[PDB]
């Protein structure tokens, strides 16, 4: 994990080129690259606090996309203006196999719109709950992709802050694509916002301590645990009870967990920041070189050359069988511009 040879220099090279590309787009964001009327709206794929994600068809090309719709007035009420500007500014600038791609963004009088690649395989969440739990080899396959994605994001000074099965879509190759950057932030040093999902919050977030990218690595610990066990390491009926468990410093593992998996998780679910994997001198390499990942070929994973655990069912284009059904609601566009100043850079 401490070794610095040829392999680590190839990674550096890749990340250096990646940052060059990202910074150009970060400093000069794309804006207003489509219009609502260019899309045929088909069906709701999911919902959040500010609006919904809908399956759409682009009229001029016939391509399907997933269009995230945010109501500007609701974003303001929830005090998510800056977070929403973060989300779009970051998404239009990044480029990685395991991140859902932003194809277009635009806004009208009422709403903000981010048109993303449609990932037809559904949420990992759906598959995980249905099958109960993943085998360790299957969990490892998914986990490896998140490790590389965080290595990428963190190198760009980005923190992701909402890792969970709900935000991981399975594509037609059986690989993961991360969605929802609503809490992603570019920060060098410390930040303090209380955000995320209760089950996945690191101790330092709960205790209002000021934190950094180490919270993403704690969250990876929670994700791997939930994938392999079928339930989270800290769960209860109410968030407050979940937080008490998270800060207690105690964690129990299923008896079927291998000793290697348990060791990795004890190092990720580490309340002590000076001891948490991903946050030490060796950085992500403590994770990449852990025995649990000994069979993982990181390059082959990135190149999508490794055989996936499963390929989602596919009944032609536009099929949404892998997604739950949601109550449909008509998109209304006011005749007056709302919150123009607040979202001017969007």
């Amino acid at each position: 994990a401490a070794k610095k040879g040829s392999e680590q220099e190839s990674v550096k090279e890749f990340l250096a080129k990646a940052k060059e590309d990202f910074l150009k787009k970060w400093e000069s964001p794309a804006q207003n690259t489509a219009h609502l009327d260019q899309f045929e709206r088909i069906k709701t794929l999911g919902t959040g606090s500010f609006g919904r994600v809908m399956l759409v068809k682009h009229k001029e090309t016939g391509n399907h996309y997933a269009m995230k719709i945010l109501d500007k007035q609701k974003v303001v009420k929830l005090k998510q203006i800056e977070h929403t500007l973060n989300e779009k500014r970051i998404l239009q600038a990044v480029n990685f196999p395991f991140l859902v791609k932003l194809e277009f963004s635009f806004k009208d009088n009422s709403n903000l719109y981010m048109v993303m690649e449609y990932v037809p395989g559904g949420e990992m969440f759906s598959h995980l709950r249905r099958i109960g739990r993943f085998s360790e080899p299957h969990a490892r396959f998914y986990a490896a992709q998140i490790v590389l994605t965080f290595e990428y994001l963190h190198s760009l000074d980005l923190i992701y802050r909402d890792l969970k099965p709900e935000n991981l879509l399975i594509d037609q190759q059986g690989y993961i694509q991360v969605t929802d950057f609503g809490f992603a932030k570019r920060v060098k040093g410390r930040t303090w916002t209380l955000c995320g999902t209760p089950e996945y919050l690191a101790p330092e977030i709960i205790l209002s301590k000021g934190y950094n990218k180490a919270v993403d690595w704690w969250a990876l610990g929670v994700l791997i645990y939930e994938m392999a066990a079928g339930y989270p390491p800290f769960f209860a009926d109410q968030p407050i009870q979940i937080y008490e468990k998270i800060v207690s410093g105690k964690v129990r593992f299923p008896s079927h967990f291998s000793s290697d998996l348990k060791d990795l998780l004890r190092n990720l679910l580490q309340v002590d920041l000076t001891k948490r994997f991903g946050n030490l001198k060796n950085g992500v390499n403590d994770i990449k070189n852990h025995k649990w990942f000994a069979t993982t070929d990181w390059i082959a994973i990135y190149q999508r050359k490794v055989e996936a655990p499963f390929i989602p069912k596919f009944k032609g284009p536009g099929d949404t069988s892998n997604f739950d059904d949601y109550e449909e609601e008509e998109i209304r566009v006011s005749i007056n511009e709302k919150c123009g100043k607040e979202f001017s850079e969007f």
């Binding site: 969440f125 999902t197 769960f235 129990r252």
Partner: peptide, 20 residues
């Protein structure tokens, strides 16, 4: 079992983000 306790809990559905 821990699994049974989870399945009987109120948080087996999609979990919302929090914000303060």
């Amino acid at each position: 079992t821990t699994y049974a306790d989870f399945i009987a809990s109120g948080r087996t559905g999609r979990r919302n983000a929090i914000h303060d």
